[PDB]
């Protein structure tokens, strides 16, 4: 469970800034202290700095479930988020699709969200930019790539694809 490299925090910095831009900062310094990253596993660790102080008496596996998993490294170096990290960066991303009950059902089974589905995007999302994915009762579902923008998104066909999946809650919240 040890600090990232300066090329390993670059790299999951430009990741996550792919979706909450600027605002990783606030991630950081919270209300209650400072929050930092650590690596286990091939696995990236979100921990309050107070936590891992005591890393004397406390395993790595055990520190492990005491912080949350917002990705892991992959073997081409890049930074693959895992959708635990939603409840985390949803607060502060910027671009967001809200998904009508259709594309709702589909997303949560990894597909991507049709025009059909489309009820509310953000202003000004640009093509390809990282957004989180909504529910119509404003409930957090994934991660996605915007197919278009938000002006080209209102001139497409139903059947085109508007937000590609990157990431949903369906991989594991089954409630079991």
């Known amino acids: 469970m040890r600090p990232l490299t300066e090329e390993e925090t670059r790299v999951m910095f430009e990741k996550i800034a792919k979706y909450i831009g600027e605002n990783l900062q606030l991630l ?6 400072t929050y930092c990253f650590r690596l286990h596993n091939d696995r990236v660790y979100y921990v309050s700095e107070k936590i891992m102080k005591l890393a004397a008496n406390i ?11 917002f990705g892991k490294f992959t073997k081409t170096h890049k930074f693959r988020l895992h959708v635990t990290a939603l409840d985390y960066l949803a607060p502060y991303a910027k671009y967001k699709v809200w998904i009508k009950p259709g594309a ?27 957004v989180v994915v909504y529910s119509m009762a404003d409930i957090p579902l994934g ?3 915007a197919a278009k923008s938000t002006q080209d998104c ?14 949903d809650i369906g991989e594991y919240v089954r409630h079991e």
């Open 28 to 33: 950081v310094d919270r209300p209650d202290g």
């Open 59 to 69: 395993s790595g596996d055990k520190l492990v479930s005491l912080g949350t998993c």
């Open 104 to 130: 709702e059902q589909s997303f949560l089974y990894g597909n991507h969200v049709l025009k059909s589905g489309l009820g509310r995007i953000t202003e000004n999302t640009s093509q390809y930019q990282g």
């Open 143 to 145: 991660f996605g790539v």
């Open 154 to 167: 209102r001139k497409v066909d139903p059947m085109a694809i508007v937000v590609f999946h990157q990431a």
